[PDB]
Design a binder for this molecule. Structure first.
Ligand SMILES: Nc1ncnc2c1ncn2[C@@H]1O[C@H](COP(=O)(O)OP(=O)(O)O)[C@@H](O)[C@H]1O
Ligand SMILES: Nc1ncnc2c1ncn2[C@@H]1O[C@H](COP(=O)(O)OP(=O)(O)O)[C@@H](O)[C@H]1O
Ligand SMILES: [Mg+2]
Ligand SMILES: [Mg+2]
Ligand SMILES: [Mg+2]
Ligand SMILES: [Mg+2]
Ligand SMILES: [Mg+2]
Ligand SMILES: [Mg+2]
Lengths: 352, 352
C-alpha cells in the first residue's frame, strides 16, 4: 500500500474560452506533461483523468469513469474491512467539489459510493451477513469544527479530543445510522448547503462507516468487520491556512520516509486539527488515495506545478492498512497453540 | 429470577357505572381477593395496582406509579446488559393497551421507558460509555407477522425463521436506529395506527435494543453489552387464537417445572409463532414480568378468575437471565489460567 494518486484535468472555464487561453497541460495515459508558458515538466501517476472536452472517445473521463477507477476501489476496500480514504487536492476552481460531490446533473464520488454501497449492502444480505451503515459530515474552517448534519443550524464549535480506543475524535459530532441512500441525501444536501463564505478555505470531511457482521452458523458465533471510508474535500491549495500548510508538512515528511530521509524526525500530525484527525489516513491504517485536480489554463501554471508536485510526493507515502477484525479471536488462537505446545512438553518430560 | 407478576384493576366502565354493577375485586397490599357474585378466592402477587378510583391516597396507582414499580426495573435491567420483558395479559376492555401504551393524556409504559431511556442514555455518555438504541414493532394476527414500522403500509406478511446465532427471527422486520424519543414516537404512533379490525385478537410486540459500549482506556480495548427489552401486548384472553392458547400451554408446562412436575415433557414453544418468537422471554434468558389486567365488574367474574389463575401460575416460572457479554473474554481468561497451570507443572516435572 503506497498512496494512489490520480490527476484530473477540468475543462477551460468561460473566461479562458473567451480569451482563448492556451492549454499547458496534456495527458498521455498515466503521464501528465506540464508545457512551458513561453522546460516541460513531466509527472506520472496511477491514473490520469482528462476531463477537458467531452466530445472525445479514448480520452474523455466523465464522472462514472472516475468512479469505476477509484470509487469502486474504496467500495471493495470497505466490505473487506479496510479503512479507505480519498482526498481531493488543488486550487480553487480546479474542480475539487465537482469530483467529490458533483452537481445535480453530474454526481461525483460521494452520491455514487452511497448509491453503490446500499446497492451492494442489499445484494449480500443473506442470513450469513448483515451491514450497518453510519455516516458523519463535518466541516473544518479556521481550525474549528462544525457539524454539517446538525439540523438546528447552530453552527456550534465542537472540540477535538484524543482517545486510547477511538484515537482523536470530534466530541459531539453526530453519527447518523442510515438504511437507504435517500436517508443520507435528505440530510446531506443540507450539509453541502451549511457552508461558510468570504467559502473556499474550509475542508469538508465525509465519513461513512460500514459494519459487516458475519455469522458462523456451524459454530453459532458472530463477528463484526468495520470499514471506514473518509471522503475529504480540502480547501484551495493556492490562522486560516494552518491546516492546509500543515498538511503540506505532513505529506513531505512521510514521502521522505520510505525514501529513507529523516527516518527519526516525527511527522507533525499534532499541529492542525485536520492533520490530527486524519492522522490515520496519512501513512496509517488506511487504503488512502489522492485526487490532484488541476486547471489546464496557462494562467494557472504556477499552482498547477505546485499541485503536480504535491501529487508526486504523495505517491511515495506508505500506508499500513490492516483489516479491522476482533483482537480477541487471534488472542484465543495463539493461547490454544501454547496449550497444545505445553501439553506435549509435559509428556516429553514425564519420561524422567 | 422467578417471573414477577403484577395485577392491575381498572375502573368500572360506563355501563357498569350506569347499571351500578358490583365490585367483586378487592386489593389488600399485594393480595387481590375475588369475592363471590352471589367462596372468595384469594391470590397474592408481587404487586397489586388498584387503578379504580383516582380520588384516593394510599390506594390509587396511576400510570407513573405503575412505571416506578415495573418500568424502572426493566430499565435498570437493560443497562446492566440483561434481556427483559413485560407481557400484558387479560380480557378485552380490562386494560391491556392503557397499561402498555396508554392514551395521549395518560402515557403507559412504552412512552415512559422511551423517555426515561434517552434521559439516562444522555446522562451517562461520558467518554467511557456509549449507547446505541434500535427499535422494532411487529404485530401478530392470525399467525402472520406484520411490521408496524413499515412506512409504505403494505401490511405484507413476513416469515419466521430459526437461526443458530439469532434464534427464531422474523425475516425482513425493520430495526430502526433511534437517537431521541421523538425519533421513535414519530414512527410508532403510526404503528399503533396500522392495526387490524373485526382488532382485539392481535398481539403487538415492541422491542427496544440497548447496545452499551464500554472502553478500557487503560487497556485500550472495547466491549459491548446488549440488552433487549420486549414489551408485549397480547390479544384478549377471553386459527385465530392459536398463539393465545399455545401461550396458555407454555405457561403451565413451565410453571409445572420448578414445581417438579413433567420435568421430562418438552415445552411446546414451536406451535405458535408467538410462543416461538418469545421462547427466550418464557423460562429463558430474560428478566421477565407479567401484568394481569382485570375488570372489577361482577359481570366479568369468570374471565377475571381465568386471568387471576394464569397470573398465579406464571409466578412459578423460573427464568435464566444472564448478562449478554462477549463469549471471547471468558475464553481468553480460562486459556490463560491453563497456561499458568501448565507452566507450573513443567517446573514441577523438571525435577526427574
Ligand atoms: N470535469 C469537469 N467537467 C465539467 N465541469 C467542471 C469539471 N470540473 C469542474 N467543473 C466546474 O468548474 C467549477 C469548478 O469548481 P469546483 O469544482 O467547485 O472546484 P473547487 O471546489 O475545487 O474549487 C465548478 O463550477 C464545476 O462544476
Ligand atoms: N386504569 C385505567 N384508568 C383509566 N382508564 C382506563 C384504565 N384502564 C383502562 N382504561 C380505559 O378503558 C379501556 C380499556 O381498554 P384497553 O385498555 O384498551 O384494554 P385492552 O387492550 O386490554 O382491551 C380503554 O379505553 C382505556 O383507556
Ligand atoms: Mg470546493
Ligand atoms: Mg477512513
Ligand atoms: Mg491544481
Ligand atoms: Mg389492546
Ligand atoms: Mg426481551
Ligand atoms: Mg382479566
Amino acid at each position: 500500500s503506497k498512496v494512489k494518486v490520480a490527476v484530473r484535468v477540468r475543462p477551460m472555464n468561460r473566461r479562458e474560452i473567451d480569451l482563448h487561453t492556451k492549454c499547458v497541460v496534456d495527458v498521455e495515459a498515466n503521464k501528465v506533461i506540464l508545457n512551458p508558458i513561453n522546460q516541460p515538466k513531466i509527472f506520472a501517476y496511477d491514473h490520469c483523468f482528462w476531463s477537458m472536452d467531452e466530445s472525445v472517445r479514448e480520452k474523455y473521463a466523465g464522472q462514472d469513469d472516475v468512479f469505476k477507477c477509484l470509487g469502486e476501489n474504496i467500495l471493495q476496500n470497505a466490505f473487506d474491512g479496510y479503512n479507505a480514504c480519498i482526498f481531493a487536492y488543488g486550487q480553487t476552481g480546479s474542480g475539487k467539489s465537482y469530483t467529490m460531490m458533483g452537481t445535480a446533473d453530474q454526481p461525483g464520488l460521494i452520491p455514487r459510493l452511497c448509491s453503490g454501497l446500499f446497492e451492494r449492502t442489499q445484494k449480500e444480505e443473506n442470513e450469513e451477513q448483515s451491514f450497518k451503515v453510519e455516516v458523519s459530515y463535518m466541516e473544518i474552517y479556521n481550525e474549528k469544527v462544525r457539524d454539517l448534519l446538525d439540523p438546528k443550524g447552530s453552527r456550534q464549535t465542537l472540540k477535538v479530543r484524543e482517545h486510547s480506543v477511538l484515537g482523536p475524535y470530534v466530541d459531539g459530532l453526530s453519527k447518523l445510522a442510515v438504511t437507504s441512500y435517500k436517508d443520507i441525501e435528505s440530510l446531506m444536501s443540507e450539509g453541502n448547503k451549511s457552508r461558510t463564505v468570504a467559502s473556499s478555505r474550509s475542508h469538508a470531511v465525509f465519513k461513512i462507516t460500514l459494519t459487516h457482521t458475519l455469522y458462523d452458523v456451524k459454530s453459532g458465533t458472530s463477528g463484526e468487520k468495520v470499514g471506514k471510508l473518509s471522503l475529504v474535500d480540502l480547501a484551495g491549495s493556492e490562522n486560516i491556512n494552518k491546516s492546509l500548510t500543515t498538511l503540506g508538512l505532513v505529506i513531505s515528511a512521510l514521502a521522505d520516509q520510505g525514501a529513507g530521509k529523516n527516518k527519526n524526525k516525527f511527522v507533525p500530525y499534532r499541529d492542525s486539527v485536520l492533520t490530527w484527525l486524519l492522522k490515520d489516513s496519512l501513512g496509517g491504517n488506511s487504503k488512502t488515495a489522492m485526487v490532484a485536480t488541476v486547471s489546464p489554463a496557462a494562467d494557472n501554471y504556477d499552482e498547477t506545478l505546485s499541485t503536480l508536485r504535491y501529487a508526486d510526493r504523495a505517491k511515495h507515502i506508505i500506508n499500513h492498512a490492516v483489516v479491522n477484525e476482533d483482537p480477541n479471536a487471534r488472542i484465543i488462537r495463539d493461547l490454544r497453540e501454547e496449550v497444545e505446545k505445553l501439553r506435549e512438553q509435559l509428556t516429553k518430560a514425564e519420561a524422567m
